[PDB]
PDB file of C-alpha atoms in Angstrom:
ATOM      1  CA  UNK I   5     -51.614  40.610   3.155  1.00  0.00           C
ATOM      2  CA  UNK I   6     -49.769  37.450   4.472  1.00  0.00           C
ATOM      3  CA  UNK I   7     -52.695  36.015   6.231  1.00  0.00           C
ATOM      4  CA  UNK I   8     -54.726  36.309   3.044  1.00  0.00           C
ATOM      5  CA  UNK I   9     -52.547  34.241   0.777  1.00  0.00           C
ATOM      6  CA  UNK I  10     -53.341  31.549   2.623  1.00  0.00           C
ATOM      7  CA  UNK I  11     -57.302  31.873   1.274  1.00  0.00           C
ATOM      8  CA  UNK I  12     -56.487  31.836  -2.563  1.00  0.00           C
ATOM      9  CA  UNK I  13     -57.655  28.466  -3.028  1.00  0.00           C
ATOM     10  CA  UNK I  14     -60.239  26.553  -1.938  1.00  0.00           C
ATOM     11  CA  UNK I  15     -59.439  25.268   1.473  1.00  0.00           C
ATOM     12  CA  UNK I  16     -61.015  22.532   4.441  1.00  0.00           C
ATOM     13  CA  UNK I  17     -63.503  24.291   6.457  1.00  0.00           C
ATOM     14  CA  UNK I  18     -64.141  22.147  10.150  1.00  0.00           C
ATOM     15  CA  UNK I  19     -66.158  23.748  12.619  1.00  0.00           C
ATOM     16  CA  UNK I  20     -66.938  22.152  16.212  1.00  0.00           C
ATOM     17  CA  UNK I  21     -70.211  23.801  18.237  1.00  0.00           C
ATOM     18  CA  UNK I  22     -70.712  22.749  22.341  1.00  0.00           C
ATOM     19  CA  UNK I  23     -74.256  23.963  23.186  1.00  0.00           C
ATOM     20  CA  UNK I  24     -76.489  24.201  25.901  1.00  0.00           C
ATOM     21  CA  UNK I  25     -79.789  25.975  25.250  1.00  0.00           C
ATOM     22  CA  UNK I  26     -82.561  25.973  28.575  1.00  0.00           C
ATOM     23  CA  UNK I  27     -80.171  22.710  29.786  1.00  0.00           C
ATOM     24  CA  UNK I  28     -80.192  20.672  26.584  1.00  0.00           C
ATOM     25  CA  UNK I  29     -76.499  19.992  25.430  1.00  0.00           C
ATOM     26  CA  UNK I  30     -75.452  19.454  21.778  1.00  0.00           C
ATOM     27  CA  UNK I  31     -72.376  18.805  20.108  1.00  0.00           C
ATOM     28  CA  UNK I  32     -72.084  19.815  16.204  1.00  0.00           C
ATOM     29  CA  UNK I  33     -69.350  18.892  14.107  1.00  0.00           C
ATOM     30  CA  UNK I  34     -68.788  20.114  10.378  1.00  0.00           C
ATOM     31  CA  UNK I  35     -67.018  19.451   7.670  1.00  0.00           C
ATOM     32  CA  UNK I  36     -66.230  20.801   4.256  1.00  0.00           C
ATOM     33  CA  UNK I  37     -64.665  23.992   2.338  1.00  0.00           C
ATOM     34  CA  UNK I  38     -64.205  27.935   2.049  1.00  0.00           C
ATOM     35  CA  UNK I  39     -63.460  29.432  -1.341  1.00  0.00           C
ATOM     36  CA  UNK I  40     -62.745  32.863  -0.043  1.00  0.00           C
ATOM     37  CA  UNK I  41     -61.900  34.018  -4.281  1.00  0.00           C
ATOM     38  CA  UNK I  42     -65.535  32.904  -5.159  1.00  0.00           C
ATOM     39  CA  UNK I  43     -67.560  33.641  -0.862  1.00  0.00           C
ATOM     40  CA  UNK I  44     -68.551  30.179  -1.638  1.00  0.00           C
ATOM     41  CA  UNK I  45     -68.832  28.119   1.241  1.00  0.00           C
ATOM     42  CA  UNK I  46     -69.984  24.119   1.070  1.00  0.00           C
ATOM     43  CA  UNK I  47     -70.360  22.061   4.881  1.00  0.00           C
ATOM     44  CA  UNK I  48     -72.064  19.449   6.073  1.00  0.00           C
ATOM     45  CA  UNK I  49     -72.674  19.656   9.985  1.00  0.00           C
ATOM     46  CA  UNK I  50     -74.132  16.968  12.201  1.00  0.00           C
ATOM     47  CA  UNK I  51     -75.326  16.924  15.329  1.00  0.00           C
ATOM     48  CA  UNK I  52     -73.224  14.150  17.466  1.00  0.00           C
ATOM     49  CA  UNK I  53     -75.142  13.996  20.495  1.00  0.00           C
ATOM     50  CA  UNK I  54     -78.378  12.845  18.634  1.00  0.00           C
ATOM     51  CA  UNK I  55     -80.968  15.264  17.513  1.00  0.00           C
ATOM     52  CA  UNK I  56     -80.884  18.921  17.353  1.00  0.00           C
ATOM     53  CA  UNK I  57     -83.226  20.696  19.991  1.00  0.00           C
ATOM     54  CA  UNK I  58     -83.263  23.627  18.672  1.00  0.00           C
ATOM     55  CA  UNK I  59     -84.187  24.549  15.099  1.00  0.00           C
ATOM     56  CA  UNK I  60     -81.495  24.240  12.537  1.00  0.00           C
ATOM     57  CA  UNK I  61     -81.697  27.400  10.826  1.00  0.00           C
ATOM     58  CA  UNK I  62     -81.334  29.538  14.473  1.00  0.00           C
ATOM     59  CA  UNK I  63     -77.469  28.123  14.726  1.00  0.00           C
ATOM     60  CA  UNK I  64     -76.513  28.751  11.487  1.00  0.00           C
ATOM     61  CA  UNK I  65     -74.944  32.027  12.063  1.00  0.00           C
ATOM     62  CA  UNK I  66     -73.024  30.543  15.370  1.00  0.00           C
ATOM     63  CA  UNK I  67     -71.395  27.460  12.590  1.00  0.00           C
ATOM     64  CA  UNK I  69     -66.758  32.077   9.229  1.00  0.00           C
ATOM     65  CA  UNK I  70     -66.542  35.805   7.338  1.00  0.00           C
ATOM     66  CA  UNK I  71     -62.596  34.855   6.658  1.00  0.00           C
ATOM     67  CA  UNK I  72     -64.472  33.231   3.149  1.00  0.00           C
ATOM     68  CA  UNK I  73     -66.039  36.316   1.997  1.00  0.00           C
ATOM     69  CA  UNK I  74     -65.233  37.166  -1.232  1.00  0.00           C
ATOM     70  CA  UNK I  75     -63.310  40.328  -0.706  1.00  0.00           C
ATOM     71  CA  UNK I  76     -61.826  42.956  -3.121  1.00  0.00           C
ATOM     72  CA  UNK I  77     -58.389  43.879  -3.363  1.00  0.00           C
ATOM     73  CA  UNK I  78     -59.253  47.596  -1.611  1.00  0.00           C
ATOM     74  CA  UNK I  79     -61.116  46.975   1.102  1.00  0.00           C
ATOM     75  CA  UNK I  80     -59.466  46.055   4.327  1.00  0.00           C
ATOM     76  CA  UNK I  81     -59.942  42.375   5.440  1.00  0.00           C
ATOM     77  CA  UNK I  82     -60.112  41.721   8.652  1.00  0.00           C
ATOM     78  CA  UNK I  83     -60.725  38.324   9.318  1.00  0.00           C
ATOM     79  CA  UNK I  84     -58.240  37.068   6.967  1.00  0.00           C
ATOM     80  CA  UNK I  85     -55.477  39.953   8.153  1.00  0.00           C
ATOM     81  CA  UNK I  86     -55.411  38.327  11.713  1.00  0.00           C
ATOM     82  CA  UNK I  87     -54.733  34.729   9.849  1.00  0.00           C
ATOM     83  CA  UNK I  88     -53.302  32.251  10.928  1.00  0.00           C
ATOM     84  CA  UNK I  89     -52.906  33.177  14.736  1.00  0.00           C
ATOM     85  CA  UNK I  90     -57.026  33.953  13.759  1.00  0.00           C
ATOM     86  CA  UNK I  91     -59.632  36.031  15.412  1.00  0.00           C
ATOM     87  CA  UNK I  92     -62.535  35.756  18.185  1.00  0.00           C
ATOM     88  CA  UNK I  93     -66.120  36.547  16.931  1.00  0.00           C
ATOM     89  CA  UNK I  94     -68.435  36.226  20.274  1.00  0.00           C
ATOM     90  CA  UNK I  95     -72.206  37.509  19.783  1.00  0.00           C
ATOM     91  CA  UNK I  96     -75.342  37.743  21.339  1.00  0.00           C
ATOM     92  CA  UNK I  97     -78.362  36.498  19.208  1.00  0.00           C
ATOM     93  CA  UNK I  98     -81.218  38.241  20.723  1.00  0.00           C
ATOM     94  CA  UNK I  99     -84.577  36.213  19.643  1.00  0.00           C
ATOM     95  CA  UNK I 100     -87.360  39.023  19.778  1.00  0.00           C
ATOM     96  CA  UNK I 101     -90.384  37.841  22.141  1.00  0.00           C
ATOM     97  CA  UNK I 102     -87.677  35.470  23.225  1.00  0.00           C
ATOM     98  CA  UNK I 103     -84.627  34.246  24.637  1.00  0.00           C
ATOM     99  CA  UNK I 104     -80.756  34.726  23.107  1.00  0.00           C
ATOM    100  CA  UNK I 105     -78.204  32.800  22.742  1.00  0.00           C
ATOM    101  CA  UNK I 106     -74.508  34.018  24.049  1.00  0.00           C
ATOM    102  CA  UNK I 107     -72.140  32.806  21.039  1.00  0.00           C
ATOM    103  CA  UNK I 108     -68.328  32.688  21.919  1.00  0.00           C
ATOM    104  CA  UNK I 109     -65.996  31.729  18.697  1.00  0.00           C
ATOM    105  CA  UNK I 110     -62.182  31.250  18.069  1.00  0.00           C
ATOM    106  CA  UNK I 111     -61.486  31.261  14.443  1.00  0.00           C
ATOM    107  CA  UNK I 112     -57.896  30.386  13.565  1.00  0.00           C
ATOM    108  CA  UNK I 113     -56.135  28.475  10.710  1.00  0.00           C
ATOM    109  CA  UNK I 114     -54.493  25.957  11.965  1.00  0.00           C
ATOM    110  CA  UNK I 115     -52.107  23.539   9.084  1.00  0.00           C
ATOM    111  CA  UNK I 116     -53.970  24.127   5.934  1.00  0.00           C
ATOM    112  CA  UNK I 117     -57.841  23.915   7.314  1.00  0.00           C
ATOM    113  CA  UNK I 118     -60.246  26.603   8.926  1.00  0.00           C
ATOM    114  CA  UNK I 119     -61.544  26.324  12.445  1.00  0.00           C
ATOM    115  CA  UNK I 120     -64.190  27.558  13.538  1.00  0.00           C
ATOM    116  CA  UNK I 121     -64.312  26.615  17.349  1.00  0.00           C
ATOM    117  CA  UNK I 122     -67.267  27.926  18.705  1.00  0.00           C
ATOM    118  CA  UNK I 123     -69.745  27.576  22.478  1.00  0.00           C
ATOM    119  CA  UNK I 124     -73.302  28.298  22.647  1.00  0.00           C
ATOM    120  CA  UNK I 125     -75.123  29.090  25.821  1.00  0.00           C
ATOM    121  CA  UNK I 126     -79.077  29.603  25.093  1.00  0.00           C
ATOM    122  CA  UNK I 127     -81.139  31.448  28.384  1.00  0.00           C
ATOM    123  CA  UNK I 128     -84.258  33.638  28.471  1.00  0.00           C
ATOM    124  CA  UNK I 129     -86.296  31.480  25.699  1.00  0.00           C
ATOM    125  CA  UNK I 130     -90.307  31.089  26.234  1.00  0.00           C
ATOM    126  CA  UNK I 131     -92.411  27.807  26.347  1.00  0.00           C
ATOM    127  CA  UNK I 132     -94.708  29.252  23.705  1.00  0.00           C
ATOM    128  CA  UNK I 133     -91.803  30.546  21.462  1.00  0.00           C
ATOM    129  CA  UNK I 134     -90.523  29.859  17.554  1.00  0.00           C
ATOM    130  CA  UNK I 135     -87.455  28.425  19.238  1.00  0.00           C
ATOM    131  CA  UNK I 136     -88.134  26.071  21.837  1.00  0.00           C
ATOM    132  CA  UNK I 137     -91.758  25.317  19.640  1.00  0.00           C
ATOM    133  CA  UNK I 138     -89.296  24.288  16.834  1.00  0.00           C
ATOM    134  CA  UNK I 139     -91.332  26.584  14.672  1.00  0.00           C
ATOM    135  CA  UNK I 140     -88.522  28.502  12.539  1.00  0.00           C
ATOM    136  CA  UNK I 141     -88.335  26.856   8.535  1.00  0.00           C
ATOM    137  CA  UNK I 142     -85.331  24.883   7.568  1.00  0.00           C
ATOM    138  CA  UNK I 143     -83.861  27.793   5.622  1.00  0.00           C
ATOM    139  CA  UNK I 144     -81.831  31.401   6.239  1.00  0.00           C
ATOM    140  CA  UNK I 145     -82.953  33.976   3.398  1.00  0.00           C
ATOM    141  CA  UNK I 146     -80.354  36.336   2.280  1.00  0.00           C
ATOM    142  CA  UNK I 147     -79.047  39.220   4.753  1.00  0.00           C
ATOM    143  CA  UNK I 148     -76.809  41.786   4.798  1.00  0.00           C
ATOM    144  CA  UNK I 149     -74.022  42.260   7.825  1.00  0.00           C
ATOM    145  CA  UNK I 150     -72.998  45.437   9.031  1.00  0.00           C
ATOM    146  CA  UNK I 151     -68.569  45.816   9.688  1.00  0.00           C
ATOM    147  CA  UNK I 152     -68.008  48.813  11.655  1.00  0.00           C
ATOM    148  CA  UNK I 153     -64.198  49.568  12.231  1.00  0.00           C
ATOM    149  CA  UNK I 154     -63.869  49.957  16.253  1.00  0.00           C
ATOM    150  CA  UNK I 155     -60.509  50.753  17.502  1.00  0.00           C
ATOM    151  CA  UNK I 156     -61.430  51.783  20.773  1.00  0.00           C
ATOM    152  CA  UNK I 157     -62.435  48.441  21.466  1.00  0.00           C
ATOM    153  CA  UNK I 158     -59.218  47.160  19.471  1.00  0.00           C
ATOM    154  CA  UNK I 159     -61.556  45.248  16.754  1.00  0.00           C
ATOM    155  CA  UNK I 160     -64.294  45.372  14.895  1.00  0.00           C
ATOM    156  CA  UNK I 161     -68.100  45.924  15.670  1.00  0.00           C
ATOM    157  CA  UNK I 162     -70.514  43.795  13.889  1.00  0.00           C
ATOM    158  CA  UNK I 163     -74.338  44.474  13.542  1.00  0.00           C
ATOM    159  CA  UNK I 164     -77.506  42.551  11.628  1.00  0.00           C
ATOM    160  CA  UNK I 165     -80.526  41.148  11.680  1.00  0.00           C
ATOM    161  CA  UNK I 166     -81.256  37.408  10.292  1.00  0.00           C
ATOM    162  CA  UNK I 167     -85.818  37.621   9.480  1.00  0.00           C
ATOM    163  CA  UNK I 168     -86.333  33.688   9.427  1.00  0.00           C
ATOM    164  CA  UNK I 169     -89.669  32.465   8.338  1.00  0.00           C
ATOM    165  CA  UNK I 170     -92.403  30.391  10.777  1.00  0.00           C
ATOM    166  CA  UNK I 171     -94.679  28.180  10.483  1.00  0.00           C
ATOM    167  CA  UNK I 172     -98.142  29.289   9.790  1.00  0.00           C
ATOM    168  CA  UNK I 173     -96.141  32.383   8.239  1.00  0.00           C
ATOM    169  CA  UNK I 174     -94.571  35.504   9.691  1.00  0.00           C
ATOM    170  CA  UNK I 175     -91.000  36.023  10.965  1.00  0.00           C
ATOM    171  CA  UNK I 176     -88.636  35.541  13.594  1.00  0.00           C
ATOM    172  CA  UNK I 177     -86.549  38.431  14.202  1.00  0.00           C
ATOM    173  CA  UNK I 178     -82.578  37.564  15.520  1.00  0.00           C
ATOM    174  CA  UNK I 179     -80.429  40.556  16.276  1.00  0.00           C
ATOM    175  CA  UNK I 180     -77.175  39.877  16.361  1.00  0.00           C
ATOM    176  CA  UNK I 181     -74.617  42.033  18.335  1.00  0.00           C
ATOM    177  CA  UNK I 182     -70.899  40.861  17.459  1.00  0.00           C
ATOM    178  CA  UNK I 183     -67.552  41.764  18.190  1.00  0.00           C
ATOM    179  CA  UNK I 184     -64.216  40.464  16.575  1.00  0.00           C
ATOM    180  CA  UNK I 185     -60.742  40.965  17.666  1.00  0.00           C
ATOM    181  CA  UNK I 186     -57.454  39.717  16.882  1.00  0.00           C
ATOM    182  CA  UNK I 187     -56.551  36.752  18.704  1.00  0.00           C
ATOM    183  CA  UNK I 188     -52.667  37.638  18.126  1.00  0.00           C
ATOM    184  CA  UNK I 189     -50.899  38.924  15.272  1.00  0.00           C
ATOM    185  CA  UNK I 190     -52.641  41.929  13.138  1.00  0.00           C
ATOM    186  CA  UNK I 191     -50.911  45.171  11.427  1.00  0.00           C
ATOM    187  CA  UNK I 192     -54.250  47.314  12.841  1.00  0.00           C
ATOM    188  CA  UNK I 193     -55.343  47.938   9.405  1.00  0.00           C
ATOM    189  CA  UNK I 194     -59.062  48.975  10.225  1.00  0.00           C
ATOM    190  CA  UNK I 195     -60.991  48.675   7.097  1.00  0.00           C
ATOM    191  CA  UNK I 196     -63.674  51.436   6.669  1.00  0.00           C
ATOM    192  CA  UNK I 197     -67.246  50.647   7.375  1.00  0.00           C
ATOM    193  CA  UNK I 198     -68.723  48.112   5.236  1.00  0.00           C
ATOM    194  CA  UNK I 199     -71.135  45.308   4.292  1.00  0.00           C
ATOM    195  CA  UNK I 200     -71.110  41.331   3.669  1.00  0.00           C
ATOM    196  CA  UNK I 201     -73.915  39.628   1.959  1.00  0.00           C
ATOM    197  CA  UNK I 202     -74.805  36.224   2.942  1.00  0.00           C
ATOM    198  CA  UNK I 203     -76.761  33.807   0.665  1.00  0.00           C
ATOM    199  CA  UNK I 204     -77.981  30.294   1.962  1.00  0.00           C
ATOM    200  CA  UNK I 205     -79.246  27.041   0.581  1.00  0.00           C
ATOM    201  CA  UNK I 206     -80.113  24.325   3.510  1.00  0.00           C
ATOM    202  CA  UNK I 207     -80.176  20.313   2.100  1.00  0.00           C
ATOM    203  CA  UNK I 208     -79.965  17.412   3.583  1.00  0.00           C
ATOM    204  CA  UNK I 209     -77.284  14.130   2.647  1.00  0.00           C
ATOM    205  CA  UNK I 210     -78.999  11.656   0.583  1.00  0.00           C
ATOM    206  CA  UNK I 211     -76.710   8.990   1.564  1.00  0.00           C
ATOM    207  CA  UNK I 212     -77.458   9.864   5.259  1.00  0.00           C
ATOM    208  CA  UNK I 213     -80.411   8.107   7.057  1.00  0.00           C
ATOM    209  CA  UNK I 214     -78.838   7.791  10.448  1.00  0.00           C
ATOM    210  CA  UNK I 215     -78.028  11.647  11.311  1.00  0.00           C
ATOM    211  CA  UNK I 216     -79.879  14.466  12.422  1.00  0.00           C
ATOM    212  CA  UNK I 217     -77.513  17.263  10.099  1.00  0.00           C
ATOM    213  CA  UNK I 218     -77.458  20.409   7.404  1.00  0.00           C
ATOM    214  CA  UNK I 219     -76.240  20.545   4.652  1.00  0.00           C
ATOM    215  CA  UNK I 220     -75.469  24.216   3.143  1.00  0.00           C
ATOM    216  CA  UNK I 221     -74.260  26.185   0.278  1.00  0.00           C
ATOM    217  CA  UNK I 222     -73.499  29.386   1.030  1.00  0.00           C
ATOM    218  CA  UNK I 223     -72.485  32.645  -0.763  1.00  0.00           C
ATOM    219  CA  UNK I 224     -70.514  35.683   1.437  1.00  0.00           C
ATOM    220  CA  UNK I 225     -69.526  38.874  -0.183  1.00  0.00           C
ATOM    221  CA  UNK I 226     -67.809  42.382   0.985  1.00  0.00           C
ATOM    222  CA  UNK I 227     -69.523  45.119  -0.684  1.00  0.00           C
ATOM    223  CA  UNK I 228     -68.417  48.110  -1.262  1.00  0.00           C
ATOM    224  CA  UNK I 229     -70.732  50.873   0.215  1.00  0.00           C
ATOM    225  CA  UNK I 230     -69.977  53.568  -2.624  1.00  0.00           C
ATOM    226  CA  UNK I 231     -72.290  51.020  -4.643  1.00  0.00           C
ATOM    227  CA  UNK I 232     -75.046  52.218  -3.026  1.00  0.00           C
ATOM    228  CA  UNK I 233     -74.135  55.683  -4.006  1.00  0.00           C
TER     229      UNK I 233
END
């Protein structure tokens, strides 16, 4: 209850990425808000170290589920553990491809939202969407799986992002995530639910220098009795 609180405004959202896909490092840097009372999310992230090589739309996911917009009933985890935050590590497994291992601290830290987060890409094919910077510049909607999973002291997260290619058809990233409590949490385990995610990908106007994304983006708990 306490950690949410601190989510009923609109609140500064900075997120820093190290990566380091086949050898090629990156550094990303964001910056912009979380309205967890609305799921709306608005960043801008650049990519310090020059240009991006890999495709924009596969590190989306790795750039914060404390901003969905959650109902009063449903447990909420990743604003529960606030401030003292959570981890949220994942492996993105490409299919016909490589993955990416994803390792994320997630903590508020004086009135603005970290998300801290490393990268390390192996496994990925000459001829692939990835490396072949073949995958669009956008994420279509998707819906995440929260499983409760005490035994593990956390919770066990499950989806599947369907990007588009070029020349058409998809490219398939599994994600496989797990989220703990990085210190503080009453162990309320919320039952099994879902988030949505909506996405829209721009670019800054006012930015010719930058290789960078711009998103809005739209995160929701839902309630699984809807479906009943």
């Amino acid at each position: 209850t306490e950690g949410a609180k601190l989510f009923e405004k609109e609140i500064p959202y900075i997120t820093e990425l190290e990566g380091d896909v086949e050898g090629m490092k990156f550094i990303i840097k964001g910056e912009g808000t979380g309205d967890a009372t609305t799921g709306t999310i608005k960043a801008k992230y650049i990519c310090t170290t020059g240009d991006l090589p890999v495709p924009w739309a596969t590190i989306l996911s790795s750039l914060v589920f404390c901003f969905a917009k959650y109902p009063r009933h449903i447990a909420d985890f990743f604003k529960s553990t606030q401030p003292d935050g959570y981890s949220q590590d994942r492996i993105i497994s490409f299919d016909n491809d490589g993955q990416y291992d994803v390792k994320a601290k997630v903590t508020y830290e004086n009135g603005t939202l970290y998300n801290r987060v490393t990268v390390k890409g192996t496994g990925f094919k000459s001829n692939g969407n990835i490396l072949g910077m073949r995958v669009l510049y956008h994420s279509p909607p998707h819906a995440v799986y929260i499983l409760p999973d005490r035994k593990n002291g956390g919770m066990k997260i499950e989806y599947n992002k369907a990007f588009d290619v070029m020349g058409g058809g998809h490219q398939m990233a599994r994600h496989a995530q797990f989220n703990k409590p990085l210190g503080a949490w009453e162990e309320d385990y919320p039952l099994y639910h879902h988030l949505t995610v909506w996405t829209s990908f721009g670019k800054d106007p006012d930015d010719d220098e930058t290789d960078h994304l711009t998103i809005v983006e739209v995160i929701k708990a839902v309630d699984l009795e809807t479906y009943r």
